[PDB]
Amino acid sequence: XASGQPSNDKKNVLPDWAFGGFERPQGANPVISPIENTKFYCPMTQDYVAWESNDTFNPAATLHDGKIVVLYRAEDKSGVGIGHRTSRLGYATSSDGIHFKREKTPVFYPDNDTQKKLEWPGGCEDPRIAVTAEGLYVMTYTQWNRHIPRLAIATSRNLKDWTKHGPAFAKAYDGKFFNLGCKSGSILTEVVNGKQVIKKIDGKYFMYWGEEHVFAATSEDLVNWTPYVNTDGSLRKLFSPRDGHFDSQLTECGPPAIYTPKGIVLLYNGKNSASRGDKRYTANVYAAGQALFDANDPTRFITRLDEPFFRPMDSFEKSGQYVDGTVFIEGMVYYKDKWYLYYGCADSKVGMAIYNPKKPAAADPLPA
Ligand SMILES: OC[C@H]1O[C@@H](O)[C@@H](O)[C@@H](O)[C@@H]1O
Ligand SMILES: OC[C@H]1O[C@H](O)[C@@H](O)[C@@H](O)[C@@H]1O
């Protein structure tokens, strides 16, 4: 029989620099689920497809015209396995971050355009959105053609009319990384006069990126990015998965990075290795971490959380299309003086949670 002693409890204490806890609002989640009946005339297919009928997940989030806007990854029924459908982005708006008005057709999708060899048939996956102080939204996303996933950039002033600029790493180093399999780009931002905007460091834009390791890149124009490289020209690893912890197979960038008085915070997704990971957590689960970098030297790693701050807790987080579970963190909005987090739930649903700095919740508990 348990005795309920405090010193044996499952608290998960955060360092002072870390965001959280993020509390799921009672009864709210999932906030975006598939809809069977909504059809789209696909300009590639030349017929109507049920574009959000399978799974709706891995979302971007931003602020526009006084509302939270989410662009959600939506998959059709054009194939069975993971990565075998076509991904297109849905559009939804909310004044409370919980109840959304969705558009019935997608806003971003593969088309008869400059990117068709890179985006057909897999489409456009896993967006992250940040905005300049001058009002240009910058989207990082994955192009998927069933051969190589590529990290790419699109821009817009209104979140509807998007210009595709192609792979982020197309141009640098005489095209060395054009064919690099890559994804998950977190541009550096800062809250200025209450609004989260893209932030320059040393006169250039900055992005953390990657799935298997955390890498970095700079840009002068927000579309052509130059990775940081080692002496021999290989990609320079800022940090990597580690034995014994939740972030043991992958350390995959999450939402845009945030410049704070303690340093730059990168919120990211860890995948737990069955062989090398933390056996207190489910093998192969994705659970979220945070890393701190030097404010004056953005590639200089300081520390990371030892335990995830947010992990699968509800049924639709614990299992779904991705059977081993995810809380795949990807969007954040500073809104009404709180932080609204948007995440994929097991590659199937969209969830949200709120960190209120004035009334902070606990982090998700240890299993342990
Ligand atoms: O990018 C191609 C595919 O890569 C897989 O590992 C998953 O991330 C899929 O959701 C994606 O469709
Ligand atoms: O399938 C789990 C997970 O795989 C990748 O590592 C991610 O980039 C996401 O696309 C997806 O949510």
Numbering used by the authors: 17 to 384
Study text:
The enzyme, BT3780, which lacks the canonical phosphate-binding basic residues, is up-regulated by the dominant human gut bacterium Bacteroides thetaiotaomicron in response to yeast mannan. BT3780 is encoded by a polysaccharide utilization locus (PUL) inthe B. thetaiotaomicron genome that orchestrates the depolymerization of yeast mannan. The data, presented here, showed that BT3780 and BACOVA_03624 are exo-acting glycoside hydrolases that cleave Man-β1,2-Man linkages using water, not phosphate, as the nucleophile in a single displacement reaction. Thus, the enzyme does not mediate phosphorolysis or reverse phosphorolysis reactions and therefore is not a glycoside phosphorylase. These data instead show that BT3780 is an exo-acting glycoside hydrolase that hydrolyzes β1,2-mannosidic linkages.
Residues 17–384 (the first 16 residues is a cleaved signal peptide, and residue 383 is the C-terminal Pro) were built into the 1.35 Å electron density map. The β-mannosidase displayed a five-bladed β-propeller fold. An extended pocket is located in the center of the β-propeller with all five blades contributing to the topology of the pocket. The pocket houses two mannose residues (the crystal structure of BT3780 was obtained in the presence of mannose), and its location corresponds to the active site of BF0772 and thus fulfills the same function in the B. thetaiotaomicron enzyme. The mannose residue in the +1 subsite (Man2) adopts a classic 4C1 chair conformation. In the −1 subsite (active site); however, the mannose (Man1) is in a B2,5/OS2 conformation, typical of the geometry adopted by the oxocarbenium ion transition state in β-mannanases and β-mannosidases. O1 of Man1 makes polar contacts with the side chains of Glu227, Glu268, and Tyr302; O2 interacts with Asp142 and Glu227; O3 forms a hydrogen bond with Asp142 and Asn74; O4 also makes a polar contact with Asn74, and Asp363 forms bidentate interactions with O4 and O6. At the +1 subsite, Man2 recognition is dominated by Lys199, which interacts with O2, O6, and the endocyclic oxygen; Arg89 makes three hydrogen bonds with O3 and O4, whereas Glu141 interacts with O4 and O6. BT3780 does not make interactions with O1 of Man2, and thus both the α and β anomers are evident. The carboxylates of both Glu227 and Glu268 hydrogen bond to the α-linked O1 hydroxyl of the mannoside with distances of ∼2.7 Å, and either could potentially activate a water molecule in the single-displacement mechanism.
